[PDB]
Design a protein around this nucleic acid. Structure first.
Length: 49
DNA sequence: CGCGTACGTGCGTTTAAGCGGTGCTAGAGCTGTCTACGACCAATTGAGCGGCCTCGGCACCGGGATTCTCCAGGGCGGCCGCGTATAGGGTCGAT
């Protein structure tokens, strides 16, 4: 259930890619062990009807 | 200390208090007679007071009912505040 689409320069995850936070997450250890490029997500989400 | 008003003060208008002069008689005050009522004395009698006793109306109280007295706590709104997020600026790397 970890699926990543890879073709040319396009990379998009079809399953899981969003961290639920680093506080108390063993994935932070994983990110320090495996070359993970983590990017913060701004919670601003406008809505269009 | 501050606000609001009610009473002091002045003036023009208006009422009756005061003066006093005069006349009338009602009622106070004086007087003269006659007596009904009160003081005063004596003898008799019971109404009123000290004493003595018994007894219950109320002082005393422990329990129970009540009638106030005070407050205390929970809820609800406001104000401040710690944490997280988000935008902005600055810095570093790449073209």
């Amino acid at each position: 259930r970890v699926a990543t689409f890879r073709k040319g320069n396009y990379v998009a995850d079809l399953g899981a890619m969003v961290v639920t936070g680093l506080g108390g997450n063993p994935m932070a250890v994983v990110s320090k062990q495996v070359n993970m490029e983590l990017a913060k997500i701004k919670q601003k989400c406008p809505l269009y009807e």
